[PDB]
Design a protein around this ligand. Sequence first.
Ligand SMILES: CCc1c(C(=O)Nc2cc(S(=O)(=O)N(CC)CC)ccc2O)[nH]c(C)c1C(N)=O
Ligand code: NA
Length: 127
Amino acid sequence: SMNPPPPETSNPNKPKRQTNQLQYLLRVVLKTLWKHQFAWPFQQPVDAVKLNLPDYYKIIKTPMDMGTIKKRLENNYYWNAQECIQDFNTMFTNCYIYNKPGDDIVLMAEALEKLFLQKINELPTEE
Ligand SMILES: CCc1c(C(=O)Nc2cc(S(=O)(=O)N(CC)CC)ccc2O)[nH]c(C)c1C(N)=O
Ligand code: NA
């Protein structure tokens, strides 16, 4: 198939708040993963047309990427910090669903996920 529209990154029908957790998720978690040498395949939605991966969006029905997550944080899309953490988890899980052990892309996800866990370890306390 072709590509779906990217996930929504704003919600007009949802109140917005600033929290220590959410700001940390942008400025520490997202930012540190973003600058990693293996971040690039996860910085934007998988372009299945350009990459000639016709089955990607047949297999992956809940796509997620760090470009989307970054915009969601900047736009205050998330009310609860867990919403953001869930999106990271979905991104990694998609990679482990679609690909095979030892694939380049899988090793890249593994390094990012390792780093992600190190960073969310020091997430500020809620509320
Ligand atoms: C390996 C395919 C893949 C990617 C990916 O994005 N790969 C990719 C992107 C471009 S790119 O043209 O879009 N590009 C210019 C360099 C990036 C801006 C070029 C080559 C590429 O291999 N991401 C995921 C989660 C997967 C997967 N299999 O799960
Ligand atoms: Na084809």
